[PDB]
């Protein structure tokens, strides 16, 4: 299992939403296309950590819902809707910008695991 502040580092993230306790992230599942599809894969992984598009509203919403999603990553920069924001803050779950596109942000994700990545 690997902390999300390490998974910020990898990616060269920044915080939108600060964790307020230590959390590990054993898997990360890739929800570039299809939200019905990354919701699939988010169901069989356990302390997920989910990599998107900050501009996939209702993707990022529902998994705000999932027991199992500890933390959000969003690529290229895309600053997400205040809806999220307040969700992340309010479920305590850490959300990550990066300015790698999702193709870089798995590269430098894989780099610490891969068998962890599924997804994509």
Same mark, same amino acid.
């Given at each position: 299992?690997?902390?999300?502040?390490?998974? +910020?580092?990898?990616?060269?993230?920044?915080?939108?939403?600060?964790? +307020?306790?230590?959390?590990?992230?054993?898997?990360?599942?890739?929800?570039?296309?299809?939200?019905?599809?990354?919701?699939?894969? $988010?169901?069989?992984?356990?302390?997920?950590?989910?990599?998107?598009?900050?501009?996939?509203?209702?993707?990022?919403?529902?998994?705000?819902?999932?027991?199992?999603?500890?933390?959000?990553?969003?690529?290229?920069?895309?600053?997400?809707?205040? $809806?999220?924001?307040?969700?992340?803050?309010?479920?305590?779950?850490?959300?990550?910008?990066?300015?790698?596109?999702?193709?870089?942000?798995?590269? +430098?994700?894989?780099?610490?695991?891969?068998?962890?990545?599924?997804?994509?």
């Amino acid at each position: 299992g690997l902390s999300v502040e390490e998974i +910020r580092e990898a990616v060269s993230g920044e915080y939108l939403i600060e964790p +307020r306790e230590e959390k590990m992230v054993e898997q990360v599942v890739i929800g570039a296309m299809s939200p019905q599809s990354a919701l699939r894969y $988010l169901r069989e992984a356990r302390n997920a950590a989910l990599v998107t598009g900050g501009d996939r509203s209702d993707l990022l919403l529902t998994a705000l819902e999932m027991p199992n999603v500890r933390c959000l990553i969003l690529t290229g920069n895309l600053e997400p809707v205040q $809806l999220v924001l307040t969700k992340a803050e309010e479920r305590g779950v850490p959300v990550i910008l990066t300015g790698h596109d999702t193709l870089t942000a798995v590269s +430098r994700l894989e780099s610490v695991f891969g068998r962890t990545r599924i997804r994509g």
